[model samples]
Target: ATKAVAVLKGDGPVQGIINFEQKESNGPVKVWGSIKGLTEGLHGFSVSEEEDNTAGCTSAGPHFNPLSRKHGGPKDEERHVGDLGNVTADKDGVADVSIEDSVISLSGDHAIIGRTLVVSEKADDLGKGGNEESTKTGNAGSRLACGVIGIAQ
Candidate 1:
């Protein structure tokens, strides 16, 4: 499988590794990883357009949505290509989950490589929330952690 890795950067003790795996071209990408030092609840995750984290987490720019669509779950046909849904952390401040995303690819125009991945402080409303940020960013709260996607050799 072709893979990429992101080492999260941010304040506090929050730290983790996110790994993306693509077994074939134009196929579903497997997202699996574990994050620690977060509040016990659901948090939003996205592939951002920003290429670097030199300006802090917020500098990652908005979510990567080359399709120019509204924010929604990864399974939604009309959602942003970067709408990755939520990762729920346990009581001990750890979140471990795996997802298979059909929209995000490791190659081509929709490739996620070289982009920044961000984990937010609140759950993404998936575009159903009646607000501007909801449609744009799922109303997800402050960015807590971010990382750059790089080839996994």
Candidate 2:
């Protein structure tokens, strides 16, 4: 089982603690974060509202990418380093999910150690303008939540 943790740093006063382990169904991209105890069904540390938009206030930046390529989509795209794709939160304001995709790996370049993961408050909408003008991941606006995924050595 793998694990990850993140420390929020920004003017948003956001912070978070997350953990993820490799699973059988996890294709390649594995996720271990929490929306529980973040806030009151909305506007919590893991995520918050920004300029009338919803973003992850505590998640760290997209995965840490040393390659510096522009991959699209979370599964079949050359996105940022720690790009774990879009974290879908349940209506109850909690995302207790674990997914595996080819984009992410349990070993090699994209390990879950010393990697930074950030969440946005502005919906990306990805190719749509209805959400924030940003088209990165989801339409979930700017940095709302963040944390870091580190492996235990």
lDDT of 2 by residue, 112-147 (tens): 455445555443343333433233344454565554
lDDT of candidates 1 onward, in order? 0.86, 0.44
Worst 10 residues of 1 by lDDT: 52-61
- Write candidate 1's Cα lDDT for 1-153 as tens digits: 689998887986677898999998877899889999889999998888886653369687488988788888888778988889999999999999698888899998778898888888999898889888888898888888888888897
Best by TM-score: 1
As for candidate 1, its clashing pairs are none
Off by over 4 Å in 2: 7-16, 23-29, 37-63, 126-140
For model 1, the stretches where C-alpha displacement exceeds 4 angstroms are 52-55
* TM-score: model 2 vs. ground truth: 0.56
